[PDB]
């Protein structure tokens, strides 16, 4: 039991990010093993709780009337466990919208049903969480290439609807991944690939972009960086652990009361980027929130 | 008007030895809260388990209309505390029991506005 068994999960070390590996198969030492969960707790409740526990340690910008959108919030069970946790984690008064391809009941303020490509919104968001995964990814019939689908929408949504100073957490796997998404992590003050301790036996990780700067700070090759991630996962077996779930005393996200300003592409200087990079500032309109779901009309 | 009374059709389905509605979302908490029935955040005590409201609401879980002016749901977006002993069927518990408007506890499980 390493000192990381007591953490909510493990973040990809900086030295692994600087390598230039070739993509290899992901062969985890404990693949298929299950973690021991607190009695009656669902896997996705444990998983979302560890992710939020980890997000609490980052320089997230947390303003009043914060805006969080959650893609891939449904499940075959018909409920939204991850949305239940985000609701628990976020400060009261936080607007939480969730969405999924299939119907499901949620504790979110608004729920949009349908492909993410049909979701539109006038407003920018402060935090984006995606747990979307296409079950067809399980058909490995060729090379492990950069997948498109909802990943294309996500790269567009981040560049167009994420407030500067805003953060993201996007679920990826060995085969469920996209190169443009890795390239985008370079447009944040900081980024990492985070593995939850309860699901440490899966190639799954959340790419976390912290404090969006709107422009590239780092040049990242997605094809190289995903190989660097698989290399790290292949060479660093992580011990399954649910210990962080037993202390829920510090869980709720602190309402840092981050400042929200409506500047144009002109007032963006170094004094500003500095404040964005420390989650001290959110830059976006503060208009009322409007979302729509396109409806294709056939016979 | 043929008003579909599912609230009772469930009571009649349980009493006939029927399996309770599953996949209610139980939350992780300290178990050191007020113990109140409905709360903006998990408030379970050492004797209660907290759940997400939407997952415990029969109307929400059956995709039907909420008997309420403007169809407002008072579980969706909140957390319901269920006595650890009756946690096997949280949906059933939220129908058969009533909340005290004075202290906010469940009448019959915490509400002591009589003794
Ligand atoms: C809620 O979130 C879900 C999960 O929690 C999360 C992670 O799930 P995962 O299964 O762990 O993923 P993975 O196997 O680690 O990666 P992969 O990209 O699916 O690999 C594809 C393929 O490659 C092989 N492989 C991959 N790896 C890493 C291997 C290995 N073989 C080994 N011997 N050793 C290994 O280390 C194996 O054959 C795999 O099938 O993904 C979501 N999700 C999964 N399935 C669905 C779904 N959501 C919706 N519908 C779904 N049907
Ligand atoms: C966690 N994090 C990492 N960094 C940057 O990456 C550096 C090293 O990343 P690190 O997470 O390994 O920090 P370290 O373990 O050195 O810090 P300690 O816990 O205080 O000892 C940080 O000092 C920052 O420059 C971060 N930068 C920003 N803006 N926000 C973050 O949340 C953040
Ligand atoms: N293009 C797409 N648009 C929207 N949702 C999608 C999608 N492709 C996959 N998904 C959804 O992604 C989800 C992955 S599993 C999500 C589990 C959920 N986060 C929880 O808390 O339990 C599935 O529900 C699937 O329907
Ligand atoms: Cl770590
Ligand atoms: Zn309801
Ligand atoms: Zn009372």
Author numbering:
A (entry chain A): 0 to 298
B (entry chain B): 18 to 132
Reproduce text from the manuscript describing this model:
Structure of Nsp10/16/Cap-1/AdoHcys was obtained when crystals of Nsp10/16/Cap-0/AdoMet were incubated with solution containing Mn2+ ions. The metal-dependent 2′-O methyl transfer catalysis was observed in the crystals. Two structures were solved at 2.25 Å (Nsp10/16/AdoMet and Nsp10/16/Cap-1/AdoHcys), and one at 2.18 Å (Nsp10/16/Cap-0/AdoMet). The electron density clearly showed the methyl group present on the adenosine moiety at the 2′-O-ribose position of the Cap-1 and no methyl present on AdoHcys. Comparison of the SSX structures of Nsp10/16 with Cap-0/AdoMet and Cap-1/AdoHcys does not reveal any significant changes in protein backbone (Cα rmsd: 0.52 Å). On the other hand, the comparison of Nsp10/16/AdoMet and Nsp10/16/Cap-1/AdoHcys complexes determined using SSX indicate larger conformational changes in the Nsp16 that are induced by the Cap-0 binding and Cap-1 formation. We observed movement of the two loops (comprising residues 28 to 35 and 131 to 146 of Nsp16), which form the capped mRNA-binding groove; positions of some residues are shifted as much as 3.00 Å, with an overall Cα rmsd of 0.40 Å. After the methyl-transfer reaction is completed, the product is released from the active site. This is consistent with the structure containing Cap-1/AdoHcys where several active site residues move, including Tyr132, the entire α-helix spanning Pro134-Lys137, and Tyr30 on the opposite site. All these residues are involved in interactions with Cap-0 and observed changes perhaps allow Cap-1 to leave.
Finally, a metal-dependent Nsp10/16 heterodimer methylates the ribose 2′-O of the first nucleotide (usually adenosine, in coronaviruses) of the nascent mRNA Cap-0-RNA to form Cap-1-RNA (m7GpppAm2′-O-RNA) using AdoMet as the donor. The Nsp10/16 complex is an α/β heterodimer. The structure of Nsp16 has a Rossmann-like fold, with a large β-sheet surrounded by α-helices, β-strands, and loops. The active site of Nsp16 MTase is conserved in the Coronaviridae family; they all utilize a Lys-Asp-Lys-Glu catalytic tetrad essential for the enzymatic activity.
